[PDB]
From a paper:
Catalases (hydrogen-peroxide:hydrogen-peroxide oxido­reductases; EC 1.11.1.6) are redox enzymes that are responsible for the dismutation of hydrogen peroxide into water and molecular oxygen. The structures reveal a homotetrameric enzyme in which each of the four active sites consists of a pentacoordinated iron protoporphyrin IX prosthetic group with a tyrosin­ate axial ligand. The heme is deeply buried inside the protein, with a complex network of channels providing access to the exterior. We have previously shown that in addition to catalase activity, the catalase from S. thermophilum (CATPO) possesses a promiscuous phenolic oxidase activity in the absence of hydrogen peroxide.
We therefore generated a series of site-directed mutants around the putative 3TR/catechol binding pocket to further test this hypothesis. The residues Pro158, His246, Gln293, Ile313, Ile314, Glu316, Leu321 and Val536 surround the 3TR binding pocket and are structurally homologous to the residues that bind NADPH in the mammalian catalases. Specifically, the variants P158W, H246W, Q293W, I313F, I314F, E316F, E316H, L321A, V536A and V536W were constructed. The bulky phenylalanine side chain of the E316F variant is oriented away from the entrance to the lateral channel and putative oxidase substrate-binding pocket and thus it is not surprising that mutations at this position show minimal effect on the oxidase activity. The catechol oxidase activities of the H246W, I314F, L321A and V536W variants were noticeably reduced (50–92%) with respect to the wild-type enzyme, whereas the E316F, E316H, I313F and V536A variants of CATPO had little effect on the oxidase activity.
Numbering used by the authors:
A (entry chain A), B (entry chain D): 21 to 618, 622 to 698
C (entry chain B): 21 to 472
Write the structure that this text describes.
């Protein structure tokens, strides 16, 4: 592997320059002990020049993100639908690297901003690097790549003052959404819990675009990529996300890192919907339109294989920051479609790496290298790391015996354009009328959420639109929301002091589709990695014993347990001063600590009770363990009878009930609904 | 072999992308067979992007140059004068890479321009990379590095029209020389034969600056580096150089390349003058002044070891163009001096690689890498190839056990500044009075040339200054030349229509120094590689037999033989159409070809005779072999009794005489002297 | 006009830093009179850092070249064949800049090498900058832009030793010519006196490709650009060229400079051959094929106007070295053709300026700027010299009242693709059979030369 050859050990030995000369780096060379620094101090200048030049441009979008290495394993020989080599045998393994991300924020912005999320997968296949550059949402805002800068300028900070960071909650974004109705479907997804996932492991990945599977005999089928999480789908609530943005901007990357380090590396089933070329327009929309899904009911999922992430980077900068994905990284057996969004992307990703890398040899960075030999006539450029032996790098040649040889459909396992593809008609800059329904599928999505889920979506819209200064933009937003759902428009209007326009029912329907609801997707299939805070005290020896007994029982089942108290000591992981409800998926108070829940110089006034109250209000399983229970639950105004509220003297019975609650994950009856 | 780990072999296999996907690259993807090209053609765009971005900025100076690999071997254990590791044992070998160059010309300019020449040597030592960045002339134009852009702006093309290329023969250059008198010494050298060397192998290399040798016990000595050619010193004549600039702009790099490929790799004795610190101002000038030599009689040469170049690059761009030398690449046992020219260079060479490489990780380029381990806390930057395992890259640390360790005089074989060095006095931007004599050493140099040599220098000055348009600049030039030598000023003045100023004898003397004359450095010590053109004909079968016999006899002695005739056939290397006297060090006509020496569609009128005439006038050994000479010698106006003119019937007698002629190399009796 | 505001006069006054602080630049600041140089000497470091960074990558091809400013004057109102604004009135003047060049040589190589020569003309029109990026030979070596690196690797120096400079006289080049027969036509031209012109003023300029002239009513015609020298055609002989390469590597740029300085600025008649769309395949070859000329006898020249060069640059680097031509610099009234060579060029010229300039704001260099207002939502990038007032740079917007407005065939004098153009068939990487005769036209060329 190209990474291993470039690993550098500094666990021993003496400091050297970059050219291997032993040096010091702690005191500048000076003319006298209190004297000026000398220009001839090369030790100073090489060190500071390196430092001065450490930074590279952040990615234009998806700047904030994190990555890990792993493995993809095929479940079968897929030759009957694709020639792709990495899919050609039961059990065949290909290394992968994945980077997850937000979209709009800059590099040090918060993981738990409300946004679309990137899910970018590189397969280092035995017939070339193959990238699926996907999002956690199956549809995209716009229908033509040429609009991308318009979308991204609108959602990024206002360019006079660069406010606000990593948020769509400002005039420009809603101006764009309200003026470009294609945006409705992705907007609805981003305003649902899909915009604030619990973790990278608790979201799915989507190619978005229709692609082609191409067999060795030239025939082709249309496909959508779906990466289905084996950890289950789950979301934060918005108020939790906001606090978490400030308490732990690194929440998602820490979650991923820790799961990998604990042997709980996240998994996905890599799947496709496969349909015939003749069905491009058979489902009531156009498969070239990236604002549309194929409903579950129209085309089932085929599981191709297993994706597992199981090793973290050695150097974040060298691996994660420098990984340079491209949908242009395609392999034989896969082909593009005439999706005008996809089409333009192919240009973008090749070009943008020149900005990032500062030179054209970015594919020679170890993370970007393939795992097979490279034979081509590309030469020179800044940062050229190869020394090519072929001194006749042109085709056609006799002086290098005609090497390298041309690869195509017939020979050398060449990539080839699906031979059945055609183009026909005028050279136009016009939108296909097949793309014009911007509202039906947003409504399909909305109809498929549970009542509380729909309320959450409405409440996200209420929150964002209320922050828009322009009355005209707000009106314009309501006009578009109304075309999806009158009810949505009425409810959102109520919060911003406007009347919703009259119902316009052109695109209203009551159809639903399976698999887009988080709330409705059943209990989590595993509770491994979920975080349990146990609130205790050092004042009572019994409180620490109760915490220790709980620790053992919960850790047995793969939960990450944090015992909290006033101060650190053996058995105590965190102080109240540093703890927060955003840090846990469930919160347990031991009844020996009841005195704290009713001042100290060691933590802010009310902190112990605030953690419990916040956990309860954010829908989490909460409880008191010990059998003197009512004191804590009364002080918190948490009802004993409540769903997801636990009161037991028995440690074993407490844990058994609580774990079912962690699986349920969120208790939604605790959220108010509109009339 | 030395950079073998970085080699890419394309002598087999199918064409791939840079990420290992088999592709074609001969036809664009199009919408129908007479259709427009598609943006989705990633094959096209990766190939053309690579091409569009092949070029990097040329070096700011010494842009035109060429390089080879080799070996340095120490003759002794030099620990008694220096702690330098590469010099610490009899027989110790260190790999080298050397680049030779001109100064002023851009990267496709002619090798045989009149200029200073670079000689840059990297030793990849076992205690880090050590560069001696030298010239073929031991002194430099200016006394402070801050003047370098002034010098280089003046000699490079006028910046309105960028004329003239690779030449000091224009107003701006002589304006500078005449207004900055420090320039006189280097100017005299560049106007001698040292400005137009016969080859890179036939010139010396000089560190120019005084440096220090530092022992392990802290004591130091002052040193000058001299690289003495084992091939002998030799020059072109100016008229020859001009024609050669047009006929073969690649003359010097082809000469080096061929010598290496034929097993005749050029050698130098790497030597120093060593003097005590107390001698800094003992020799009538300042050892910190880079416009002065230490005369050979004042300090002898000590031979340290042998430099041999014996392997050519695999890829010019990757190795030669990308090699990034720095005087800042120093090792333990060497130190700097307070030479204001040297001092500023240290800044420049670190900085300028940012321009060339486009990013700060230029020492990771294969040619720039060291051959020992690197341990340091430099991180990130564009083009970062390493994956560092130490995740605590700061000092001081406990979390990486205090590694890497600090290296200094007492531990880790650290570089250290010579401990005896001091500074004292005001912080000044003033020139030391010790630097003020700009004229005595130019006069020393001139006094040390043979009469014909002095004439050549006068004739170079006459040529250049006659091309200067401004009468004021010409007057000013004569004023400065006059301070070196009245005679020189009178002789130059005669050519440009002005009166020389009255003698000013402040700096006039008759001292001489050994070893700076080319003319006077005796016969070449070897004639291997020297070029012998044999002029023949296809019209007479005996002329080709005479040529073949000569070939065998001459090749036996390691000479490169070119048989020339009207057309190519077995035994004939070149046609008259492509041949020129600049192509040979000696010219032989076989007497069977005598008929050619008095029109043809196969070569320009008079070409055979022109080759002979030109060779004779440029001072080369010339001859007729067969015993019938007078017809060829009469047509050429060459006297049979002339020095370096040979006429013999016997092949063996002809070759024996001719080879002595090749060693003499130039017959200077054929050049007229001023009264 | 954009050049004016950036002219810098140093014929008086005291030396300053780049931030206007009066300084010296002749002696380093040192710790004692015989002492080491100090790091705190900012005068030294700003000066040397500037110098250390003066150089930029040479152009990947046509590295060796020289340029001058001038004027184009239309002879007529051409609206009856093209909507192009710079051609819409008798007497209308448009400023130009032209750069002439060789192809294969690096910077510093000799003007009088044997090669194809570039003739690149920028018209700074009142509807945007329009570049005709042409050569002195009307046909090109290859039939598909994807081959360009193959061609250029073969004719440039062998990459082990970088020999030989600025010459096709080596194995690799003739290997390519002999293996790629399309090369025959251009090869014949380059081996004639067209390979060694007497001067830039004594050669013609050719767009090479078939382009389209598009009227305001959407109809189109096929055209070839020809720039006809008013100085006459003339060549060196090869032996002369070789000697001249050594005696004066700057021969062509000095000739141009001197002619302009003496009031003898060179002139060309800017002309086209114009044929109907239906004639794309009428002349026994394909007008999409850039290895073919339209013989003089098949389609006459129409003279559009006069090109005159009459002013030399003030700063060679700022003007000549930095001028960044693109066939993508097109204006309303002109369109592309499905010439696979042209098609790929459009990509190349936009991309390559990132290499040269080191950042994306290369059109802000004064030589590259237009002479009309710029209204668009392009933002930021290294070296951004504008300060944009529009704080809502996206479309569609209400917050900047929908500005800037879309320009198209019916609004804002927008560029538009010729409405008649169409595509049909499979997506193929195949060469049209209509491109297959590589030899007839080379023979036509050779038959048309005098015996000598
Ligand atoms: C036309 C431009 C454009 C369009 C229409 C899109 N993108 Fe994109 N995307 C970029 C232009 C781009 C980019 C500027 O080229 C980035 C920035 C850094 C890079 O490598 O490419 C990028 C980055 C980027 C990343 C981050 C990869 C990483 O972790 O390094 C993801 C996951 C996506 N995009 C996904 C998408 C999806 C799922 C899209 C629509 C279906 C989409 N992009 C449309
Ligand atoms: C203050 C600036 C300055 C000064 C006073 C000098 N140089 Fe220098 N030199 C440079 C600035 C520079 C540079 C701009 O930094 C270069 C350009 C390319 C490079 O790598 O360094 C360079 C290149 C360069 C090269 C080419 C190395 C190669 O082949 O890559 C040689 C041989 C020299 N120089 C030699 C000298 C000598 C013998 C000098 C005085 C004794 C000298 N230079 C003074
Ligand atoms: C696919 C790439 C490619 C192809 C097929 C061509 N060229 Fe090109 N040309 C370039 C890629 C390019 C380039 C790399 O993009 C350059 C170098 C610097 C620049 O601005 O563009 C260039 C420069 C360049 C210049 C120099 C302009 C200047 O003075 O700055 C001229 C005159 C031409 N070309 C002319 C042509 C003609 C007449 C061609 C065929 C009919 C042609 N090129 C085909
Ligand atoms: Ca805003
Ligand atoms: Ca194909
Ligand atoms: Ca001048
Ligand atoms: Ca001489
Ligand atoms: Ca070759
Ligand atoms: Ca001719
Ligand atoms: Ca750059
Ligand atoms: Ca159009």
């Amino acid at each position: 592997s190209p990474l291993a050859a470039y690993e550098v050990d500094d666990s021993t030995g003496y400091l050297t320059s970059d050219v291997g000369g032993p040096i010091q780096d702690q005191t500048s060379l000076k003319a006298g002990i209190r004297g000026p620094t000398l220009l001839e101090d090369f030790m100073f200048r090489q060190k500071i020049q390196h430092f001065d030049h450490e930074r590279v441009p952040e990615r234009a979008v998806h700047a904030r993100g994190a990555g890990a290495h792993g493995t993809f394993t095929s479940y079968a020989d897929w030759s009957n639908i694709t020639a792709a080599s990495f899919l050609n045998a039961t059990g065949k393994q290909t290394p992968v690297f994945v980077r997850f991300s937000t979209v709009a924020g800059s590099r040090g912005s918060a993981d738990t901003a409300r946004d679309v999320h990137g899910f970018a997968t590189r397969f280092y296949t035995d017939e070339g690097n193959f990238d699926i550059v996907g999002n956690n949402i199956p549809v995209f805002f716009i229908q033509d790549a040429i609009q991308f800068p318009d979308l991204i300028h609108s959602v990024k900070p206002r360019p006079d003052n660069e406010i606000p960071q990593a948020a769509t909650a400002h005039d420009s974004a809603w101006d764009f959404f309200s003026q470009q109705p294609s945006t409705m479907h992705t907007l609805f997804w981003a305003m649902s819990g899909h915009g604030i996932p619990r973790s990278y492991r608790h979201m799915d990945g989507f190619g978005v675009h229709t692609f082609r599977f191409v067999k060795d005999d030239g025939s082709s089928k249309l496909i959508k990529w779906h990466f289905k999480s084996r950890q289950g789908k789950a979301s934060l609530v918005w108020e939790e996300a906001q606090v978490l943005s400030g308490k732990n901007a690194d929440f998602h990357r820490q979650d991923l890192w820790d799961a990998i380090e604990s042997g709980n590396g996240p998994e996905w089933d890599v799947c496709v919907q496969i349909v015939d070329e003749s069905q491009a327009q058979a489902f009531g929309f156009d498969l070239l339109d990236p604002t549309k899904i194929i409903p579950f009911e129209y085309a089932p999922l085929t599981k191709l294989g297993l994706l597992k992430l199981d090793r973290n980077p050695t150097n974040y900068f060298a691996e994660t920051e420098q990984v340079m994905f491209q949908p242009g990284h395609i392999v034989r057996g896969i082909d593009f479609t005439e999706d005008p969004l996809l089409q333009g992307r192919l240009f973008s990703y090749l070009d943008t790496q020149l900005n990032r890398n500062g030179g054209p040899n970015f594919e020679q960075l170890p993370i970007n290298m393939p795992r097979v030999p490279i034979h081509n006539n590309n030469r020179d450029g800044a940062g050229q790391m190869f020394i090519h032996r072929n001194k006749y790098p042109y085709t056609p040649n006799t002086l290098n015996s005609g090497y390298p040889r041309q690869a195509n459909q017939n020979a050398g396992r060449g990539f080839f354009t699906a031979p059945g593809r055609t183009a026909s008609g005028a050279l136009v800059r016009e939108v296909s009328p097949t793309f014009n329904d911007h509202w039906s599928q947003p409504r399909l999505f909305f109809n498929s959420l549970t009542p509380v889920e729909q309320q959450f979506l409405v409440n996200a819209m209420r929150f964002e639109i209320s922050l828009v200064k322009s009355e005209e933009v707000k009106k314009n937003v309501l006009t578009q929301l109304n075309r999806v759902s009158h009810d949505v428009a009425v409810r959102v209007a109520a919060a911003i002091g406007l009347g919703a326009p009259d119902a316009d029912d052109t695109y209203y329907h009551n159809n639903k589709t399976a698999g887009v609801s988080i709330v409705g997707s059943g209990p989590l299939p595993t509770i491994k990695t979920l975080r349990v805070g146990i609130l205790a005290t050092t004042s009572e020896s019994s409180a620490l014993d109760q915490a220790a007994q709980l620790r053992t029982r919960l850790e047995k089942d793969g939960l990450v347990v944090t015992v909290v108290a006033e101060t650190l000591r053996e058995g105590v992981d965190q102080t109240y001063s540093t703890a927060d409800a955003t840090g846990f998926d469930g919160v347990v108070v031991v009844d020996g600590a009841a005195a704290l829940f009713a001042s100290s110089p060691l933590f802010p006034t009310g902190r112990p009770l605030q953690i419990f109250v916040d956990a309860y209000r954010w829908g989490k399983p909460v409880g008191v363990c010990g059998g003197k229970s009512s004191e804590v639950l009364d002080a918190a105004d948490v009802p004993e009878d409540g769903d997801g509220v636990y009161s037991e003297e028995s440690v074993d019975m407490f844990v058994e009930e609580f774990e079912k609650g962690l699986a349920t994950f969120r208790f939604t009856d605790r959220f108010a609904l509109d009339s």
